[PDB]
Short mmCIF file of C-alpha atoms in Angstrom, two decimals:
data_model
loop_
_atom_site.label_atom_id
_atom_site.label_comp_id
_atom_site.label_asym_id
_atom_site.label_seq_id
_atom_site.Cartn_x
_atom_site.Cartn_y
_atom_site.Cartn_z
CA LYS A 1270 25.42 47.93 7.09
CA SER A 1271 24.34 49.76 9.79
CA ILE A 1272 21.82 48.15 12.31
CA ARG A 1273 18.59 49.45 13.65
CA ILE A 1274 17.02 47.69 17.14
CA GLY A 1275 14.75 50.12 17.59
CA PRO A 1276 13.52 54.19 17.37
CA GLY A 1277 16.81 56.21 18.11
CA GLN A 1278 19.20 52.61 18.60
CA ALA A 1279 20.65 52.11 15.23
CA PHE A 1280 24.31 51.34 15.41
CA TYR A 1281 27.18 51.10 13.01
CA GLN B 160 19.74 30.82 13.82
CA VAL B 161 19.18 32.11 17.13
CA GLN B 162 17.12 29.80 19.70
CA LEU B 163 15.49 30.93 22.75
CA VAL B 164 14.45 29.20 25.38
CA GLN B 165 12.15 30.35 28.54
CA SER B 166 12.05 29.07 31.80
CA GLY B 167 8.88 26.95 33.18
CA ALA B 168 5.15 27.81 34.31
CA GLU B 169 4.30 29.70 37.21
CA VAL B 170 1.74 29.69 39.68
CA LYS B 171 1.39 33.09 41.43
CA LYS B 172 -0.90 34.51 44.37
CA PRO B 173 -2.07 38.31 44.26
CA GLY B 174 0.56 40.65 45.26
CA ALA B 175 3.40 38.05 44.73
CA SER B 176 6.57 38.57 42.02
CA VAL B 177 7.81 36.47 39.34
CA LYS B 178 10.92 36.52 37.39
CA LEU B 179 10.68 35.23 34.43
CA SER B 180 14.15 34.30 31.92
CA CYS B 181 14.95 33.72 28.37
CA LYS B 182 18.34 31.93 27.43
CA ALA B 183 20.16 32.92 24.00
CA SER B 184 21.80 30.41 22.07
CA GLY B 185 23.12 29.58 18.62
CA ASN B 186 24.93 32.55 16.42
CA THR B 187 26.71 35.32 18.63
CA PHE B 188 25.42 39.36 17.72
CA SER B 189 27.50 41.97 19.01
CA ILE B 190 24.07 44.22 18.83
CA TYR B 191 20.71 42.79 19.75
CA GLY B 192 17.64 43.52 21.56
CA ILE B 193 15.28 41.49 23.79
CA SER B 194 11.12 42.17 23.96
CA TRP B 195 8.89 40.59 26.38
CA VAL B 196 5.60 40.62 24.97
CA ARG B 197 1.99 39.01 26.63
CA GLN B 198 -0.81 37.45 25.68
CA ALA B 199 -4.22 37.07 27.99
CA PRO B 200 -5.76 33.63 27.31
CA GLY B 201 -7.79 34.58 24.22
CA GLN B 202 -6.71 38.33 23.71
CA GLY B 203 -3.75 39.95 21.29
CA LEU B 204 -0.30 40.79 21.95
CA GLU B 205 1.24 43.52 24.15
CA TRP B 206 4.21 44.90 24.13
CA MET B 207 5.63 45.03 27.69
CA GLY B 208 9.32 46.16 27.66
CA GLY B 209 12.73 45.60 26.13
CA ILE B 210 16.84 45.66 26.55
CA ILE B 211 19.60 46.26 24.21
CA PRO B 212 22.21 44.74 26.70
CA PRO B 213 25.18 45.62 24.53
CA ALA B 214 24.67 49.62 25.23
CA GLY B 215 22.57 49.25 28.72
CA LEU B 216 19.91 50.94 27.26
CA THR B 217 16.15 49.87 28.00
CA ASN B 218 12.49 50.95 27.43
CA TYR B 219 9.16 50.38 29.48
CA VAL B 220 5.29 50.67 28.97
CA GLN B 221 3.91 53.55 31.23
CA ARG B 222 0.70 51.82 31.84
CA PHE B 223 2.99 48.82 34.01
CA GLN B 224 3.92 51.53 36.62
CA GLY B 225 7.22 50.43 37.18
CA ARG B 226 6.13 47.10 37.64
CA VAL B 227 8.48 45.13 35.58
CA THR B 228 12.22 45.50 35.51
CA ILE B 229 14.32 43.70 32.32
CA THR B 230 17.84 42.63 33.46
CA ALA B 231 20.37 40.72 31.38
CA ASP B 232 23.15 38.49 32.29
CA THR B 233 25.79 38.63 29.65
CA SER B 234 27.77 35.85 30.88
CA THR B 235 24.96 33.29 30.36
CA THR B 236 23.60 35.13 27.54
CA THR B 237 20.10 35.27 29.63
CA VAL B 238 17.42 37.97 30.26
CA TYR B 239 15.08 37.77 33.00
CA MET B 240 11.70 39.78 33.20
CA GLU B 241 10.62 40.41 37.26
CA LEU B 242 6.98 41.84 37.22
CA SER B 243 5.67 42.80 41.09
CA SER B 244 2.66 43.16 42.94
CA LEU B 245 0.82 40.66 40.23
CA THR B 246 -2.59 40.56 40.50
CA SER B 247 -5.31 38.32 38.13
CA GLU B 248 -5.12 40.15 35.23
CA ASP B 249 -1.69 39.87 34.93
CA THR B 250 -2.64 35.88 34.07
CA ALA B 251 -1.00 35.62 30.75
CA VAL B 252 1.51 33.55 28.56
CA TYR B 253 4.87 35.30 28.15
CA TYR B 254 7.05 35.30 25.42
CA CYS B 255 10.74 37.07 24.65
CA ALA B 256 11.65 37.54 21.45
CA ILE B 257 14.98 39.07 20.10
CA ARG B 258 15.54 41.94 17.65
CA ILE B 259 18.77 41.81 15.46
CA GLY B 260 18.45 44.69 12.88
CA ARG B 261 15.09 43.52 11.09
CA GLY B 262 11.83 42.31 13.34
CA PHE B 263 11.45 40.03 16.19
CA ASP B 264 13.06 37.35 14.02
CA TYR B 265 13.19 34.63 16.76
CA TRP B 266 10.37 34.09 19.51
CA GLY B 267 10.36 32.03 22.71
CA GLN B 268 8.17 29.03 23.20
CA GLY B 269 6.76 31.21 25.73
CA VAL B 270 5.25 30.69 29.79
CA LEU B 271 2.23 30.18 31.37
CA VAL B 272 1.58 32.42 34.65
CA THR B 273 -1.18 32.03 36.76
CA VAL B 274 -1.88 34.40 39.68
CA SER B 275 -4.85 33.61 41.63
CA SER B 276 -5.80 33.29 45.17
CA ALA B 277 -7.01 29.33 44.20
CA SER B 278 -5.33 26.46 45.74
CA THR B 279 -4.17 23.62 43.76
CA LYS B 280 -7.18 21.37 43.08
CA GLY B 281 -7.74 18.12 40.98
CA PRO B 282 -10.80 17.87 38.63
CA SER B 283 -13.89 15.88 38.95
CA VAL B 284 -14.96 13.95 36.25
CA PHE B 285 -18.58 13.33 35.31
CA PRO B 286 -19.34 11.30 32.47
CA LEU B 287 -21.70 13.10 29.67
CA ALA B 288 -23.47 9.93 28.73
CA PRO B 289 -26.17 9.97 25.45
CA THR B 290 -23.79 9.03 14.96
CA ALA B 291 -23.47 8.95 18.53
CA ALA B 292 -21.92 12.29 21.23
CA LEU B 293 -20.51 11.14 24.66
CA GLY B 294 -18.05 12.92 26.45
CA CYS B 295 -16.45 14.00 30.18
CA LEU B 296 -17.07 16.96 31.85
CA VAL B 297 -13.55 17.61 33.91
CA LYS B 298 -14.53 20.33 35.94
CA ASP B 299 -13.32 22.76 38.96
CA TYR B 300 -9.65 22.26 38.95
CA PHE B 301 -6.50 24.66 39.60
CA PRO B 302 -4.61 25.32 37.97
CA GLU B 303 -4.36 24.37 34.01
CA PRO B 304 -3.58 22.31 32.46
CA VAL B 305 -5.13 18.86 32.51
CA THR B 306 -4.62 16.31 29.86
CA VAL B 307 -7.91 14.20 28.06
CA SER B 308 -7.72 10.65 26.23
CA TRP B 309 -9.86 8.44 24.76
CA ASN B 310 -9.42 4.39 25.65
CA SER B 311 -5.94 4.55 26.79
CA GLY B 312 -4.99 6.95 23.84
CA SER B 313 -6.55 4.45 20.78
CA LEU B 314 -9.54 6.42 20.13
CA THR B 315 -9.03 9.59 18.70
CA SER B 316 -10.83 9.86 15.70
CA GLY B 317 -13.81 12.32 16.33
CA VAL B 318 -12.77 13.44 19.42
CA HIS B 319 -13.01 17.17 20.29
CA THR B 320 -11.37 18.66 23.70
CA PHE B 321 -12.65 22.34 24.32
CA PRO B 322 -10.59 24.62 25.77
CA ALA B 323 -11.06 25.48 29.37
CA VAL B 324 -13.19 28.31 30.63
CA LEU B 325 -12.31 29.83 34.04
CA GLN B 326 -15.58 29.87 36.32
CA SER B 327 -16.27 32.66 38.62
CA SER B 328 -15.67 30.41 41.62
CA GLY B 329 -11.76 30.53 40.75
CA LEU B 330 -11.19 26.68 39.21
CA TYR B 331 -11.01 25.99 35.58
CA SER B 332 -13.67 23.09 33.80
CA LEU B 333 -13.63 21.62 30.22
CA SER B 334 -15.40 19.01 28.28
CA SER B 335 -13.68 16.35 26.04
CA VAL B 336 -16.63 14.59 23.59
CA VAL B 337 -16.40 12.15 20.74
CA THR B 338 -18.71 10.90 18.53
CA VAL B 339 -19.15 7.41 17.65
CA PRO B 340 -21.37 4.74 15.19
CA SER B 341 -24.50 4.44 17.55
CA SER B 342 -24.36 0.69 17.02
CA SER B 343 -20.87 0.39 18.37
CA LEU B 344 -22.82 1.72 22.04
CA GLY B 345 -22.62 -1.49 24.23
CA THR B 346 -20.24 -3.33 21.71
CA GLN B 347 -17.67 -1.04 22.97
CA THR B 348 -16.77 0.57 26.34
CA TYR B 349 -15.85 3.85 26.11
CA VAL B 350 -13.76 5.44 29.17
CA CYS B 351 -11.84 9.11 29.15
CA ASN B 352 -8.12 9.16 31.05
CA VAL B 353 -7.83 12.87 32.83
CA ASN B 354 -4.73 13.75 34.33
CA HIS B 355 -3.84 16.79 35.94
CA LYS B 356 -0.15 17.16 37.01
CA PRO B 357 -0.02 20.07 39.23
CA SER B 358 -2.70 18.22 41.67
CA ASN B 359 -1.35 14.75 41.08
CA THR B 360 -4.23 13.60 39.67
CA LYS B 361 -5.19 10.48 37.39
CA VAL B 362 -9.03 9.37 37.06
CA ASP B 363 -10.55 7.07 34.59
CA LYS B 364 -14.00 7.20 33.78
CA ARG B 365 -16.85 4.82 31.85
CA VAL B 366 -19.21 6.53 29.93
CA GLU B 367 -22.23 4.33 29.75
CA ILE B 368 -25.92 5.04 28.29
CA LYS B 369 -28.20 5.17 31.56
CA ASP C 225 0.52 55.90 21.67
CA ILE C 226 0.04 55.54 18.04
CA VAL C 227 -3.27 53.26 17.82
CA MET C 228 -3.00 50.36 14.80
CA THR C 229 -6.38 49.20 13.78
CA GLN C 230 -6.73 46.08 11.65
CA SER C 231 -9.59 44.92 8.82
CA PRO C 232 -11.26 42.71 8.65
CA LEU C 233 -11.61 40.75 11.75
CA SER C 234 -12.27 37.52 10.19
CA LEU C 235 -10.99 36.42 6.58
CA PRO C 236 -12.74 33.12 5.60
CA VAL C 237 -10.43 32.06 2.41
CA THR C 238 -11.12 29.11 -0.26
CA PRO C 239 -7.91 26.73 -0.98
CA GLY C 240 -5.46 28.33 -3.63
CA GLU C 241 -7.18 31.96 -3.35
CA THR C 242 -5.47 35.01 -2.50
CA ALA C 243 -5.73 36.66 1.90
CA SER C 244 -5.83 40.13 1.85
CA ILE C 245 -5.43 42.44 4.94
CA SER C 246 -5.40 45.44 5.66
CA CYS C 247 -3.66 47.88 8.80
CA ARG C 248 -4.18 51.24 9.72
CA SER C 249 -1.67 53.54 12.05
CA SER C 250 -2.79 56.76 13.10
CA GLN C 251 0.37 58.38 12.44
CA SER C 252 3.12 57.76 9.77
CA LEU C 253 5.65 54.78 10.12
CA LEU C 254 7.56 56.48 7.58
CA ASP C 255 11.20 57.43 9.03
CA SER C 256 11.66 60.16 6.70
CA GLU C 257 15.83 59.88 7.54
CA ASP C 258 16.57 56.53 6.87
CA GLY C 259 13.77 56.62 4.31
CA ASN C 260 11.92 53.05 6.05
CA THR C 261 8.70 52.44 6.97
CA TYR C 262 9.05 50.42 10.46
CA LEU C 263 5.72 48.10 9.91
CA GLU C 264 5.96 44.37 10.78
CA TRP C 265 3.59 41.70 10.41
CA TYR C 266 3.30 38.38 12.35
CA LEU C 267 1.62 35.19 12.51
CA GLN C 268 0.55 33.17 15.33
CA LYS C 269 -0.46 29.57 14.31
CA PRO C 270 -2.95 28.30 16.60
CA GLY C 271 -1.32 26.94 19.73
CA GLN C 272 2.14 28.13 18.45
CA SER C 273 4.40 31.39 19.47
CA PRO C 274 3.83 34.10 16.93
CA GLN C 275 6.49 34.15 14.21
CA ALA C 276 7.99 37.04 11.72
CA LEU C 277 6.67 37.64 8.29
CA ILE C 278 7.38 41.29 7.02
CA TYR C 279 10.01 43.89 8.34
CA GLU C 280 10.60 47.39 7.17
CA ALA C 281 6.47 47.39 5.46
CA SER C 282 7.87 45.00 2.36
CA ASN C 283 10.81 42.91 3.63
CA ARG C 284 10.37 39.06 4.09
CA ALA C 285 11.59 37.49 6.84
CA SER C 286 14.11 34.42 6.25
CA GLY C 287 12.54 31.26 5.20
CA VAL C 288 9.07 33.09 4.37
CA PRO C 289 7.81 31.70 0.68
CA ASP C 290 7.24 34.66 -1.62
CA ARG C 291 3.80 34.40 -1.77
CA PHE C 292 4.05 36.41 1.41
CA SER C 293 4.03 39.54 0.33
CA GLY C 294 3.84 43.33 2.43
CA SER C 295 2.81 46.68 0.91
CA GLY C 296 1.18 49.89 1.30
CA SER C 297 1.28 54.27 2.12
CA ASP C 298 2.92 55.25 5.13
CA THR C 299 -0.08 54.77 7.06
CA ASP C 300 -2.28 52.02 5.32
CA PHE C 301 -0.92 49.00 4.85
CA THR C 302 -1.69 45.42 2.92
CA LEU C 303 -0.72 41.91 3.72
CA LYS C 304 -1.51 39.53 0.67
CA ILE C 305 -1.18 35.69 0.83
CA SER C 306 -1.26 33.95 -2.26
CA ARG C 307 -2.06 30.59 -3.03
CA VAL C 308 -3.53 30.06 0.64
CA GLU C 309 -3.28 26.48 1.84
CA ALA C 310 -4.17 25.43 5.56
CA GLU C 311 -0.81 26.10 7.15
CA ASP C 312 -1.43 29.38 6.80
CA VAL C 313 -4.68 29.44 8.96
CA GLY C 314 -4.16 31.37 12.19
CA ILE C 315 -4.16 35.16 13.50
CA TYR C 316 -2.02 37.74 11.70
CA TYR C 317 -1.06 40.93 13.59
CA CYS C 318 0.93 44.21 12.21
CA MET C 319 3.09 46.16 14.63
CA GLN C 320 4.83 49.09 14.57
CA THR C 321 8.33 50.32 15.65
CA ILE C 322 8.81 53.80 14.92
CA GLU C 323 8.28 55.15 18.36
CA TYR C 324 8.52 53.74 21.75
CA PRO C 325 5.91 52.22 22.99
CA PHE C 326 5.96 49.54 20.17
CA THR C 327 2.33 48.70 19.49
CA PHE C 328 0.16 45.73 17.57
CA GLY C 329 -2.72 45.94 15.94
CA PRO C 330 -5.81 43.78 17.42
CA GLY C 331 -5.50 41.05 15.04
CA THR C 332 -7.24 39.26 11.64
CA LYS C 333 -8.15 35.72 11.76
CA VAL C 334 -7.47 33.50 8.56
CA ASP C 335 -9.64 30.39 8.69
CA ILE C 336 -10.29 27.89 4.91
CA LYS C 337 -13.52 28.63 3.58
CA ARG C 338 -15.91 25.95 2.73
CA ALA C 339 -19.39 24.96 2.22
CA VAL C 340 -22.10 25.96 4.95
CA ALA C 341 -22.41 22.91 7.23
CA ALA C 342 -25.07 22.80 9.87
CA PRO C 343 -24.05 21.51 13.32
CA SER C 344 -25.43 18.34 14.84
CA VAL C 345 -26.51 19.23 18.24
CA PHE C 346 -26.42 16.79 20.94
CA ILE C 347 -27.89 17.46 25.12
CA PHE C 348 -26.32 16.07 27.81
CA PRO C 349 -27.69 16.17 31.26
CA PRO C 350 -26.36 15.75 34.32
CA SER C 351 -24.80 12.60 36.17
CA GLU C 352 -26.08 11.36 38.92
CA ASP C 353 -22.72 11.28 40.62
CA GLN C 354 -22.65 14.97 40.09
CA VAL C 355 -26.08 15.32 41.29
CA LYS C 356 -25.10 14.14 45.13
CA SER C 357 -22.06 16.92 44.57
CA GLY C 358 -25.41 19.83 45.50
CA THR C 359 -23.99 21.92 41.94
CA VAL C 360 -24.88 20.43 38.63
CA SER C 361 -23.74 21.54 34.86
CA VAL C 362 -25.87 20.84 31.84
CA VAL C 363 -23.96 20.55 28.42
CA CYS C 364 -24.73 21.27 25.20
CA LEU C 365 -22.67 20.07 22.05
CA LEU C 366 -22.89 21.70 18.60
CA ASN C 367 -20.21 19.76 16.47
CA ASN C 368 -18.88 20.16 13.42
CA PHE C 369 -20.13 23.13 11.52
CA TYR C 370 -18.96 25.96 9.58
CA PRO C 371 -19.11 29.26 9.21
CA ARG C 372 -17.63 29.48 13.09
CA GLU C 373 -20.77 32.09 14.08
CA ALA C 374 -23.42 29.97 16.08
CA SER C 375 -25.95 30.81 18.91
CA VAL C 376 -27.02 28.96 21.93
CA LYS C 377 -30.11 29.49 24.42
CA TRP C 378 -31.14 27.68 27.15
CA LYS C 379 -35.01 27.26 28.00
CA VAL C 380 -36.07 25.71 30.98
CA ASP C 381 -39.56 24.36 31.09
CA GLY C 382 -40.06 26.53 27.86
CA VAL C 383 -38.61 29.77 29.35
CA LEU C 384 -35.53 31.48 28.51
CA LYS C 385 -32.54 30.92 30.92
CA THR C 386 -29.73 33.84 30.73
CA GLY C 387 -26.50 34.35 32.96
CA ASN C 388 -25.52 30.91 34.09
CA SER C 389 -24.17 29.59 30.08
CA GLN C 390 -19.84 29.63 29.20
CA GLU C 391 -19.09 28.98 25.86
CA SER C 392 -16.02 26.88 24.81
CA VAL C 393 -15.02 26.84 20.66
CA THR C 394 -12.39 24.71 19.12
CA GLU C 395 -10.19 25.89 16.62
CA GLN C 396 -10.71 24.76 12.58
CA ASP C 397 -10.19 21.51 12.14
CA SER C 398 -7.89 20.46 9.38
CA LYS C 399 -9.40 17.05 8.45
CA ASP C 400 -12.49 18.80 7.94
CA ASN C 401 -12.75 22.30 7.92
CA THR C 402 -15.30 22.66 11.03
CA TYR C 403 -15.64 24.09 14.19
CA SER C 404 -17.18 22.66 17.11
CA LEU C 405 -18.80 24.40 20.32
CA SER C 406 -19.75 23.59 24.31
CA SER C 407 -22.54 25.38 25.87
CA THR C 408 -22.37 24.46 29.85
CA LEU C 409 -25.59 25.78 32.45
CA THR C 410 -24.65 25.49 35.82
CA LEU C 411 -27.18 25.39 38.70
CA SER C 412 -27.94 24.29 42.10
CA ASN C 413 -28.85 20.72 42.20
CA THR C 414 -32.02 22.36 43.99
CA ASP C 415 -33.01 24.94 41.12
CA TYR C 416 -32.24 21.61 39.07
CA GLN C 417 -34.82 19.97 40.47
CA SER C 418 -37.87 22.28 40.66
CA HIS C 419 -37.95 21.72 37.20
CA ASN C 420 -38.25 19.24 34.12
CA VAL C 421 -37.73 20.20 30.85
CA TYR C 422 -34.28 21.26 30.04
CA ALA C 423 -33.40 22.39 26.17
CA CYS C 424 -30.70 24.20 24.31
CA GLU C 425 -32.21 25.94 21.13
CA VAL C 426 -29.01 26.22 18.06
CA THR C 427 -29.05 29.08 15.55
CA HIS C 428 -26.63 29.00 12.31
CA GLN C 429 -26.96 29.59 9.18
CA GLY C 430 -26.86 25.97 7.90
CA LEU C 431 -29.97 25.30 9.65
CA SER C 432 -33.00 26.92 7.95
CA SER C 433 -34.63 27.11 11.55
CA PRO C 434 -33.24 27.28 14.92
CA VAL C 435 -32.83 23.30 16.31
CA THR C 436 -33.93 22.52 19.86
CA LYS C 437 -32.71 19.42 21.49
CA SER C 438 -34.49 18.82 25.52
CA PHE C 439 -34.20 15.86 27.98
CA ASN C 440 -36.70 15.57 30.87
CA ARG C 441 -35.44 15.34 34.09
CA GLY C 442 -35.08 11.65 35.22
CA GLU C 443 -36.84 9.93 32.35
#
């Protein structure tokens, strides 16, 4: 499950 | 899961800088971001900026004209916010909050930063003399906060202590009031106990019918 | 840059009924690539830090009971609270995270709706000890009233005095769901001694006509 911290800042 | 613990209250003169900290503990996340959010007395929430330490990324708000710098110490798992060129308008409670894939899931307890040219000053305490009402006026102190109790804390029913107001003089003022059975006046004594820790003040004042 | 608005400003709810508050964004909060809508809701109880309620428009944060729900389009959002209880009193904020800078709505205040209750009004003259200081305060207390809206006018020898008073109001008290309010008039002592009758006039929905409490200086 990928992790979205902010706008344009999503991580595997 | 996570607990965020913030540094203690700060009092600064205009033009000075202040550095706040936010230490994270509890569970560990490989990816997270920490933001700072401020709230001026009686006002709404304002996002100030954030950092994503694992990625080396930061985001700031233009309005603050580069006066905010956010840094992280990986070793101590602590995040800092430094705010420069302070003015009276930066007086506020500052929160840190963490994002780990949802929203701001966890928040710090807040830290009051007071920016003023005023000097530390203990309050004057005046009786407000008279169901009957009576109270104490706690006036001309700096900075926040004061504490007020009645009859050494044994009188709590019917007590209201108002939030302080900032006077145009730069000093704070508040009243604490209590309502009591009219027949009990003169059969009972009423004393307000005022503490102002920043000025090492402790004052008791008896409140009587004149 | 994205402007967030909320409605209403204040929302009284009777115990066990449903609160519905709205939020509007000036732009779509839909991320059409990952398919989520980045709208969050937060509660700040009186004197506490904000706490998470909703994320991605309709998902509940951990520990949030199912009587809180989020819904909406991509621009117009609704937070629904069923079975409202005293612990739900506070300010609710929406916040967008589709774009930097993150922006908050102005907050909607929820309180517990009870029957209208008129204030008990009290006026206090300055103490002899304050008179010696050269500056005096006259305090008007409005005690235990509902709803929060109330107005205070100061009169000196019957004439309206504006410009030198400040007010302060309590949060809603959980014991009787009421508010209290103080109004403080600050004067030089030389001014204070130059007049005689000091009065505060109180207007509130619970009062059929404005109530005035007064004293005569020295009496």
